[PDB]
Design an enzyme around this catalytic site. Structure first.
Site, PDB file in Angstrom:
ATOM      1  N   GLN A  19       1.281  -1.677  -0.087  1.00 15.50           N
ATOM      2  CA  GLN A  19       0.492   0.434  -0.073  1.00 15.50           C
ATOM      3  C   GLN A  19       0.840   0.800  -0.092  1.00 15.50           C
ATOM      4  OE1 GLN A  19      -1.895  -1.185   3.903  1.00 15.50           O
ATOM      5  NE2 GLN A  19      -1.572   1.752   4.804  1.00 15.50           N
ATOM      6  N   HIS A 162      -6.515  -1.045  11.896  1.00 19.31           N
ATOM      7  CA  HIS A 162      -6.146  -1.272  10.220  1.00 19.31           C
ATOM      8  C   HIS A 162      -7.124  -2.765   9.119  1.00 19.31           C
ATOM      9  CE1 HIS A 162      -3.157  -2.409   6.958  1.00 19.31           C
ATOM     10  NE2 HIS A 162      -2.996  -3.720   7.933  1.00 19.31           N
ATOM     11  N   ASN A 182      -1.634  -9.924   4.476  1.00 18.34           N
ATOM     12  CA  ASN A 182      -1.625  -7.738   5.106  1.00 18.34           C
ATOM     13  C   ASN A 182      -1.140  -7.459   3.378  1.00 18.34           C
ATOM     14  OD1 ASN A 182      -1.892  -5.062   7.021  1.00 18.34           O
ATOM     15  ND2 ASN A 182       0.348  -5.891   7.638  1.00 18.34           N
TER      16      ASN A 182
END
Ligand SMILES: *C(N)CNC(=O)[C@H](CC(C)C)N[C@@H](c1ccc(-c2ccc(S(N)(=O)=O)cc2)cc1)C(F)(F)F
Length: 215
Positions: A19, A162, A182
């Site tokens: 990200q 998150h 993730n």
């Protein structure tokens, strides 16, 4: 329902993405859940566009953060989301540039898992596939993770900050876990993945804000 399952072995999960310096975790968690549903419905595994979500979901804040529910609702109302090739990830806030010619999938809403119920989250993963989940990822022990089943008594169940993807569940040396994908690249954790504690009093609030899209 099975005692253990890993959807990565079934070809329902795309490679780990990064990200970067943008709080777009919600967008990566969202596309991950949509990618799993696209593979179940059509048999084809494709990379969906998180940038399409950061730029276009007006109910979210782009690189400032957001929710997966708002991302799913947008995909439904827009009647589509672009593939990664048709709308590349740049890691910054830009104007909505959705291209209908690059449409790779759509959804018809979402369903939420009952708050705090890890057993319901288990049945959801076994029956539908990858589910988007919210966790507390603020601790130093989380950032520097590498191998084993993660558990930290300082992890908050109410301070969710998150968004990740639950791609399965299992047992590692007596300890029950959740296979978590993730969006911090392959250099982080165990090749981008983390095994989080399952059935240890909703550790890090894993079952507090879980949802999956309907196709
Ligand atoms: C991931 N890289 C950063 N974390 C988040 O985006 C988290 C995700 C999980 C689901 C908790 N959410 C944030 C958050 C939610 C909402 C907003 C926000 C949305 C829309 C506006 S707007 N554009 O209407 O003004 C403002 C803010 C920001 C962050 C949090 F805070 F943890 F809940």
């Amino acid at each position: 329902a099975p005692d253990s399952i890993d959807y990565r072995k079934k070809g329902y999960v795309t490679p780990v993405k990064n990200q970067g310096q943008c709080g777009s975790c919600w967008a990566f968690s969202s596309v991950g859940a949509l990618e799993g549903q696209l593979k179940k419905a059509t048999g084809a595994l494709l990379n969906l566009a998180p940038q399409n979500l950061v730029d276009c979901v007006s109910e979210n804040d782009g690189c400032g953060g957001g929710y997966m529910t708002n991302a799913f609702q947008y995909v439904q109302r827009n009647r589509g989301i672009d593939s990664e090739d048709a709308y590349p990830y740049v890691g910054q806030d830009e104007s909505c540039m959705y291209n209908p010619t690059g449409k790779a999938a759509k959804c018809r809403g979402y369903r939420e898992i009952p708050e705090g119920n890890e057993a319901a989250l288990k049945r959801a993963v076994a029956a539908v596939g990858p589910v988007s989940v919210a966790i507390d990822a603020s601790l130093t022990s989380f950032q520097f993770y590498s191998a084993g089943v993660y558990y930290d008594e300082n992890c908050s169940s109410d301070a969710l900050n998150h968004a990740v993807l639950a791609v399965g569940y299992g047992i590692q040396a007596g300890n029950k876990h959740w296979i978590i994908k993730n969006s911090w690249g392959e250099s982080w954790g165990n090749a981008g993945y983390i095994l989080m504690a399952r059935n240890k009093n909703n550790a890090c609030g894993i079952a507090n804000l879980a949802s999956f899209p309907k196709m």
